[PDB]
Design a protein around this motif. Structure first.
Motif, PDB file in Angstrom:
ATOM      1  N   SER B  65      86.827  31.657  24.020  1.00  0.00           N
ATOM      2  CA  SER B  65      86.094  30.543  24.753  1.00  0.00           C
ATOM      3  C   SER B  65      86.415  30.047  24.237  1.00  0.00           C
ATOM      4  N   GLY B  66      85.942  29.350  22.849  1.00  0.00           N
ATOM      5  CA  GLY B  66      85.244  28.546  22.698  1.00  0.00           C
ATOM      6  C   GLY B  66      83.832  27.552  22.424  1.00  0.00           C
ATOM      7  N   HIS B  67      83.318  28.169  23.753  1.00  0.00           N
ATOM      8  CA  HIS B  67      81.739  27.602  23.648  1.00  0.00           C
ATOM      9  C   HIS B  67      81.274  27.646  22.065  1.00  0.00           C
ATOM     10  N   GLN B  69      82.470  26.635  19.228  1.00  0.00           N
ATOM     11  CA  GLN B  69      82.716  25.828  18.589  1.00  0.00           C
ATOM     12  C   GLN B  69      82.451  24.981  18.976  1.00  0.00           C
ATOM     13  N   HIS B  70      82.104  24.727  20.884  1.00  0.00           N
ATOM     14  CA  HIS B  70      81.835  23.800  21.182  1.00  0.00           C
ATOM     15  C   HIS B  70      80.557  23.600  22.026  1.00  0.00           C
ATOM     16  N   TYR B  71      79.452  24.442  22.782  1.00  0.00           N
ATOM     17  CA  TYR B  71      78.702  24.391  23.450  1.00  0.00           C
ATOM     18  C   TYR B  71      77.589  25.440  22.617  1.00  0.00           C
ATOM     19  N   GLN B 138      71.219  28.659  39.601  1.00  0.00           N
ATOM     20  CA  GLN B 138      72.426  29.937  40.040  1.00  0.00           C
ATOM     21  C   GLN B 138      73.458  29.169  40.703  1.00  0.00           C
ATOM     22  N   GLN B 139      74.399  28.699  39.472  1.00  0.00           N
ATOM     23  CA  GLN B 139      75.937  28.130  40.050  1.00  0.00           C
ATOM     24  C   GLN B 139      76.309  28.492  40.989  1.00  0.00           C
ATOM     25  N   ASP B 140      76.881  27.772  42.422  1.00  0.00           N
ATOM     26  CA  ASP B 140      78.119  28.771  43.299  1.00  0.00           C
ATOM     27  C   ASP B 140      79.424  28.411  42.466  1.00  0.00           C
ATOM     28  N   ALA B 217      89.142  15.946  30.864  1.00  0.00           N
ATOM     29  CA  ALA B 217      88.062  16.628  30.325  1.00  0.00           C
ATOM     30  C   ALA B 217      89.686  17.061  28.953  1.00  0.00           C
ATOM     31  N   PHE B 218      89.729  17.532  27.838  1.00  0.00           N
ATOM     32  CA  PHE B 218      90.667  17.915  26.561  1.00  0.00           C
ATOM     33  C   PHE B 218      91.456  19.496  27.371  1.00  0.00           C
ATOM     34  N   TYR B 219      90.425  19.838  28.103  1.00  0.00           N
ATOM     35  CA  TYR B 219      91.267  21.313  28.547  1.00  0.00           C
ATOM     36  C   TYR B 219      91.986  20.854  30.247  1.00  0.00           C
ATOM     37  N   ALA B 238      79.607  18.183  42.874  1.00  0.00           N
ATOM     38  CA  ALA B 238      80.536  18.626  43.864  1.00  0.00           C
ATOM     39  C   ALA B 238      81.731  19.551  41.795  1.00  0.00           C
ATOM     40  N   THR B 239      82.255  19.791  41.735  1.00  0.00           N
ATOM     41  CA  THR B 239      83.701  20.242  41.098  1.00  0.00           C
ATOM     42  C   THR B 239      85.366  20.490  40.678  1.00  0.00           C
ATOM     43  N   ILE B 240      85.874  19.879  40.954  1.00  0.00           N
ATOM     44  CA  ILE B 240      87.367  20.836  40.897  1.00  0.00           C
ATOM     45  C   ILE B 240      87.912  20.485  39.255  1.00  0.00           C
ATOM     46  N   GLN B 241      88.054  21.309  38.469  1.00  0.00           N
ATOM     47  CA  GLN B 241      88.510  21.424  37.656  1.00  0.00           C
ATOM     48  C   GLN B 241      89.487  22.468  37.055  1.00  0.00           C
ATOM     49  N   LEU B 242      90.690  21.574  36.179  1.00  0.00           N
ATOM     50  CA  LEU B 242      91.804  22.666  36.046  1.00  0.00           C
ATOM     51  C   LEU B 242      91.086  22.863  34.931  1.00  0.00           C
ATOM     52  N   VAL B 268      91.174  27.044  38.483  1.00  0.00           N
ATOM     53  CA  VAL B 268      90.797  26.301  38.485  1.00  0.00           C
ATOM     54  C   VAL B 268      89.103  26.150  38.269  1.00  0.00           C
ATOM     55  N   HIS B 269      88.194  25.668  37.926  1.00  0.00           N
ATOM     56  CA  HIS B 269      87.264  26.125  38.349  1.00  0.00           C
ATOM     57  C   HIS B 269      86.510  25.246  39.471  1.00  0.00           C
ATOM     58  N   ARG B 270      85.497  25.643  40.147  1.00  0.00           N
ATOM     59  CA  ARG B 270      84.948  24.665  40.906  1.00  0.00           C
ATOM     60  C   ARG B 270      83.835  25.175  41.147  1.00  0.00           C
TER      61      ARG B 270
HETATM   62  C1  LIG Z   1      83.658  25.801  25.833  1.00  0.00           C
HETATM   63  C2  LIG Z   1      83.794  23.886  26.301  1.00  0.00           C
HETATM   64  C3  LIG Z   1      82.729  22.981  26.367  1.00  0.00           C
HETATM   65  C4  LIG Z   1      83.644  22.432  26.718  1.00  0.00           C
HETATM   66  C5  LIG Z   1      83.423  21.216  25.982  1.00  0.00           C
HETATM   67  C6  LIG Z   1      81.954  21.451  27.396  1.00  0.00           C
HETATM   68  C7  LIG Z   1      82.152  20.263  28.629  1.00  0.00           C
HETATM   69  C8  LIG Z   1      81.114  19.617  28.007  1.00  0.00           C
HETATM   70  C9  LIG Z   1      82.168  20.175  30.069  1.00  0.00           C
HETATM   71  O1  LIG Z   1      83.438  19.924  30.578  1.00  0.00           O
HETATM   72  C10 LIG Z   1      82.075  21.273  30.907  1.00  0.00           C
HETATM   73  C11 LIG Z   1      82.645  21.471  31.616  1.00  0.00           C
HETATM   74  O2  LIG Z   1      83.259  20.404  32.582  1.00  0.00           O
HETATM   75  O3  LIG Z   1      82.235  22.728  32.764  1.00  0.00           O
HETATM   76  C12 LIG Z   1      82.759  22.348  34.051  1.00  0.00           C
HETATM   77  C13 LIG Z   1      81.864  22.913  34.750  1.00  0.00           C
HETATM   78  C14 LIG Z   1      82.387  23.675  35.838  1.00  0.00           C
HETATM   79  C15 LIG Z   1      81.751  23.434  36.648  1.00  0.00           C
HETATM   80  C16 LIG Z   1      80.313  22.745  36.520  1.00  0.00           C
HETATM   81  C17 LIG Z   1      80.587  22.593  35.243  1.00  0.00           C
HETATM   82  C18 LIG Z   1      79.680  22.690  34.236  1.00  0.00           C
HETATM   83  O4  LIG Z   1      79.075  24.006  34.281  1.00  0.00           O
HETATM   84  O5  LIG Z   1      78.631  21.890  33.444  1.00  0.00           O
HETATM   85  C19 LIG Z   1      83.848  23.640  34.160  1.00  0.00           C
HETATM   86  C20 LIG Z   1      84.374  23.781  33.040  1.00  0.00           C
HETATM   87  C21 LIG Z   1      84.556  24.672  32.120  1.00  0.00           C
HETATM   88  C22 LIG Z   1      85.590  25.271  30.861  1.00  0.00           C
HETATM   89  C23 LIG Z   1      85.935  25.376  29.944  1.00  0.00           C
HETATM   90  C24 LIG Z   1      85.742  27.377  29.843  1.00  0.00           C
HETATM   91  N1  LIG Z   1      85.019  27.936  29.541  1.00  0.00           N
HETATM   92  C25 LIG Z   1      86.946  24.820  29.301  1.00  0.00           C
HETATM   93  O6  LIG Z   1      87.698  25.946  28.912  1.00  0.00           O
HETATM   94  C26 LIG Z   1      85.729  25.195  28.395  1.00  0.00           C
HETATM   95  C27 LIG Z   1      86.746  24.431  26.598  1.00  0.00           C
HETATM   96  C28 LIG Z   1      84.607  25.017  27.976  1.00  0.00           C
END
Ligand SMILES: C[C@@H]1C[C@H](C)C[C@H](C)[C@@H](O)CC(=O)O[C@H]([C@@H]2CCC[C@H]2C(=O)O)C/C=C/C=C(\C#N)[C@H](O)[C@@H](C)C1
Ligand SMILES: C[C@@H]1C[C@H](C)C[C@H](C)[C@@H](O)CC(=O)O[C@H]([C@@H]2CCC[C@H]2C(=O)O)C/C=C/C=C(\C#N)[C@H](O)[C@@H](C)C1
Ligand SMILES: [Zn+2]
Ligand SMILES: [Zn+2]
Lengths: 402, 402
Positions: B65-67, B69-71, B138-140, B217-219, B238-242, B268-270
Motif C-alpha cells: 500500500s505504501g504505508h 515507505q510513507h506512514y 473510528q472513522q466513518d 496528493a501525488f496519488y 469531510a474529504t473526497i479523495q481520488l 474514492v476515499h471518502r
Molecule cells: C500511504 C500513503 C500515505 C499518504 C502519503 C499519507 C498522506 C499524509 C495523506 O495524503 C493521507 C491522506 O490524505 O489520507 C486520506 C484519508 C482519507 C480521509 C481522511 C484521510 C485520513 O485518513 O487522514 C485518504 C487517502 C488514503 C490514501 C492511500 C492509501 N492507502 C494512498 O494510496 C496512500 C499512498 C497513502
C-alpha cells in the motif's frame, strides 16, 4: 463447513496477510451487526450500560491487572516513546478504571458495564482455524459491579439472559459450577457466601446442573455454560465468573448503606455469545446455510414473470428495501421464472416475491418461500407488516409461521 | 470546553495509562453509537455496504500500500513469529483485498464499501489534546470503486451526502478543489479526466468553491470540505479523495462492458465526519452541552410529585426506556418539584415528565421542556409516539416542535 459456507454464501474470508483475523463481506457484516444489535436490544431491557474503551494500554495497567504476569505471551506488545504498551486481550481492567473514575455509592449498585471492544490475543499460527481459533474478535462483554448480598440476584438475571438468547437460537444448554480450588486467593468466608448464593441461584433456576469441585479459578468461583447444536455437539460459550482479586488490585470501593466507605465490590465477568466470531462460525455450521429471517443476509428475492413487469419488481423491491429488509431482485431476461425461484432457494433466500401482470394491477406479490411453499397473493403492505413482525420477534421458522 | 463539558456531563474521560485514547461513559457511548447509527441510516439509502476488517496486518501489505515507505512513523508495529505486523492506520488496503477477493464486473460498479473499524495512529504525547488530536479513533470510512466515466456522478452523490448530514447538524460549509501537484504519479490523461469531472460536479452542485492548484496528493486530486460551527469557527472533517495509485499497487481490475478485463477502477476515499471522536468534540463544543433530542444522552427526566406516585413514575420511566429513549428518574423525597425540574433543565434533559396522582389514574404525564415551556398533559403512548417521530427525523428543535 462454516468456512466453505462463508465463501459460498460470500459471507467472510481469510487472507494470509492477517492470520487469525477475518474479512466480513457486506452480508457476513450484516450478520455481525445483527447479532450485536440483538445483544444490545437485550442490554437495554436488562439494565446494561454500554461503554467504549481504548484498545491499547501501558504495561503498568497489565502489571496491576496481572496479565503481564500470567498472560504475557498471549499479548501483542510494542513500544511507544520508550514505554511498554500492549493491545488489550481483555476489557476488564479498562472497566475497572471506569468504576474507579469517581466515587460510587451503594445506590449505583449493581452497576453493569457492557463492551463490544476489539480484543486481540496471540495464538500460535499453526493452531489457527477459521472463526473458531482466532487472534482477533469482539466478545459480548459485560461486567457486573455489585455487593456480595446482591450476587444471588444478579446471577439469576444472568441466567434469565442466557435462556432468552439461546431460546432465540433454538439451542439447548447445560450448566456446571466450578468452586474453590486447592490454591485460591482472598478470604474463604467471601468464597463461601458467593458459592452459597451461586448454588441458590442455580437451584432456583430449575435446570439440572453439575458441580465440579475445586475446578474454579484462583480469583473466583464460576458457572460455565455449554450449547448444544442441531446435530448434538457441545460448545463452551457462556460463562459467569466472579472476581475478588480485581477489586483489590485496582483498589475498588463503594460507599455502603452504613455507610462505611472501605467496602470493595465483587466483579462479575460475563459473556453469552462468547465472541461474535465464534457465534458466527457455530451458527453457520448449525443452520447449514439456512439463516433465520432476522439473521439472514438474503431476506427477499423479487422476481418478475416477464420484462413487462421489470419496472414493478423494481418498485416492490425498493419498498421492501425501504422497510429495512435485505431485498434483491432478479431481472435477467434470459432466464426462466422457475430457474430464478430455484436459484434463489439454493442461494438460501427466505422469501421469494414473484410479480406479474395480475400482481402489478392489484399492487400485490405472489409469496414463495425457501422451502418452497406457497403463501399466496398478498398486498405489499400486508407482506411488509408480517415480515416486520417476523423480524422483530426473531422467529426461527419465519417461512412456516408466515 | 469540550473536555470540561465531557466531564461535567459525565460523557468521557482520559487516563494516563492510555494517552490519545478515550474512555466513553454510557452517555458518551450513547452519543457515539447514535452518530454511527445516523451514518448507517444514510448508508442504507445511498447504496453503501458495510464490512468488517482486521485491525492488524503483515508488513507485506503495508509495503504494498505504501504505508511502510510513507506512514511508518505514525504506525504501531510489533513482531509476531519473527514477522513484522502493524495496527491499521487506515482501512484502505484491506478493502482493496476485499475488491480483489473475486473477479468483478462493470455490473458491480460502483462498489461502495464502508468501514467503521478502529484505527490507531502514533501521535506525540505533546500533540495530544482531548478528542481533537488522538491516537485512537473510528472513522466513518468509505471507498468507492467506480469506472472513470462514473466519477462525475459519484462525486455528485458524495456532495449530496455531505449536504444531508451537515444539514441535520445545521452546519454551513466550504468546498475546495486541490488538483495535480508538481510531483505526481499516474498518467496525466487520467488526471485530466478526473479533474474535469470533479470541476463539472462541483459546478452542478451549485455552491461556491475555491481552486487550490497543485495542492493535491501525488496519488490523486481531491475535494476538501470545512464545516462552520455556530460560533463561526471552521473545522476540517469531510474529504473526497481520488486514488489511481492504490488500484495499480494492488493490481485491481474489473471486466468492462466491452469485454476488456484489464481496466482498473478509480478508488474514492471518502469520510464525512472524519472520526466519531472528532465529531463528538466539535458537537460538544458547538451545542454547549445542549443536545438535540436524538443525540441527547439525557432525553427524559421522570419526576414524581410525591412518594405515592413513586410507583407510576418508575413505570413511565420504564416504558420510555423500553421505547429506546434515555430516561432517568428523580426520586429524592427530600427535594422539591421545582428544584428537580430546574436541576433537570440545568442538566439539559430535553423533556421533563412530571407525574402526580392525577396523572397516575389517567395514565398520562405532564410535559415540560428544557427551555421551561409547558406542553400540557398527554398519554404515555402519545408522548412516546411524538418523541419517537422527533427522534427518527432527528429534529434540531424537538422541544419547540413537540
Ligand atoms: C500511504 C500513503 C500515505 C499518504 C502519503 C499519507 C498522506 C499524509 C495523506 O495524503 C493521507 C491522506 O490524505 O489520507 C486520506 C484519508 C482519507 C480521509 C481522511 C484521510 C485520513 O485518513 O487522514 C485518504 C487517502 C488514503 C490514501 C492511500 C492509501 N492507502 C494512498 O494510496 C496512500 C499512498 C497513502
Ligand atoms: C490476568 C488473569 C489471567 C487468567 C489467569 C487467565 C486464565 C486463562 C483464565 O482465568 C481467563 C478467564 O477465564 O477469563 C474469563 C473470561 C471471561 C469471559 C471469557 C473468558 C475469556 O476472556 O477467555 C474472565 C476473567 C477475567 C479475569 C481477570 C481479569 N482481568 C482476572 O482478574 C485475571 C487474574 C486474569
Ligand atoms: Zn471480564
Ligand atoms: Zn481511504
Amino acid at each position: 463447513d462454516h468456512r466453505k459456507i462463508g465463501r459460498d454464501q460470500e459471507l467472510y474470508f481469510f487472507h494470509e496477510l492477517s492470520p487469525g483475523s477475518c474479512f466480513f463481506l457486506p452480508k457476513g457484516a450484516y450478520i455481525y451487526n445483527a447479532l450485536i444489535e440483538f445483544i444490545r436490544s437485550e442490554y437495554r431491557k436488562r439494565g446494561f450500560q454500554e461503554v467504549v474503551t481504548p484498545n491499547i494500554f501501558n504495561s503498568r495497567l497489565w502489571m496491576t491487572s496481572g496479565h503481564w504476569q500470567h498472560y504475557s505471551e498471549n499479548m501483542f506488545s510494542f513500544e511507544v516513546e520508550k514505554e511498554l504498551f500492549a493491545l488489550k486481550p481483555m476489557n476488564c481492567p479498562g472497566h475497572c478504571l471506569m468504576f474507579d473514575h469517581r466515587p460510587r455509592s451503594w445506590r449505583e449498585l449493581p452497576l453493569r458495564l457492557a463492551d463490544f471492544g476489539v480484543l486481540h490475543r496471540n495464538e500460535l499460527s499453526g493452531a489457527l482455524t477459521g472463526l473458531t481459533r482466532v487472534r482477533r474478535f469482539q466478545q459480548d462483554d459485560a461486567h457486573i459491579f455489585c455487593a456480595m448480598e446482591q450476587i444471588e440476584d444478579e446471577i439469576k438475571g444472568c441466567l434469565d439472559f442466557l435462556r432468552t438468547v439461546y431460546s432465540v437460537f433454538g439451542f439447548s444448554f447445560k450448566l456446571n459450577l466450578s468452586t474453590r480450588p486447592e490454591k485460591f486467593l482472598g478470604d474463604i468466608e467471601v468464597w463461601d457466601q458467593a458459592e452459597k448464593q451461586l448454588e441458590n441461584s442455580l437451584n432456583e433456576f430449575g435446570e439440572k446442573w453439575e458441580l465440579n469441585s475445586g475446578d474454579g479459578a484462583f480469583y473466583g468461583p464460576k458457572i460455565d455454560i455449554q450449547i448444544k447444536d442441531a446435530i448434538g455437539r457441545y460448545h463452551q460459550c457462556a460463562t459467569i465468573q466472579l472476581d475478588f482479586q480485581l477489586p483489590i488490585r485496582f483498589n475498588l470501593t463503594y460507599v455502603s448503606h452504613d455507610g462505611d466507605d472501605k467496602k470493595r465490590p465483587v466483579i462479575v465477568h460475563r459473556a453469552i455469545l462468547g465472541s461474535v466470531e465464534r457465534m458466527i462460525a457455530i451458527l453457520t455450521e448449525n443452520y447449514g446455510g439456512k439463516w433465520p429471517f432476522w439473521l439472514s443476509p438474503r431476506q427477499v428475492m423479487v422476481v418478475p414473470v416477464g420484462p413487462t413487469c421489470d419496472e414493478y419488481a423494481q418498485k416492490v423491491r425498493q419498498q421492501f428495501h425501504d422497510a429495512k429488509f435485505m431485498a434483491d431482485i432478479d431481472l435477467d431476461p434470459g432466464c426462466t421464472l422457475n430457474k430464478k425461484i430455484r436459484n434463489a432457494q439454493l442461494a438460501q433466500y427466505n422469501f421469494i416475491l414473484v410479480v406479474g401482470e395480475k400482481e402489478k394491477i392489484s399492487g400485490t406479490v405472489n409469496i414463495r418461500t425457501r422451502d418452497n411453499k406457497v403463501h399466496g397473493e398478498r398486498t405489499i403492505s400486508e407482506t411488509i407488516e408480517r415480515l416486520q413482525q417476523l423480524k422483530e420477534f426473531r422467529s426461527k421458522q419465519a417461512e412456516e409461521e408466515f
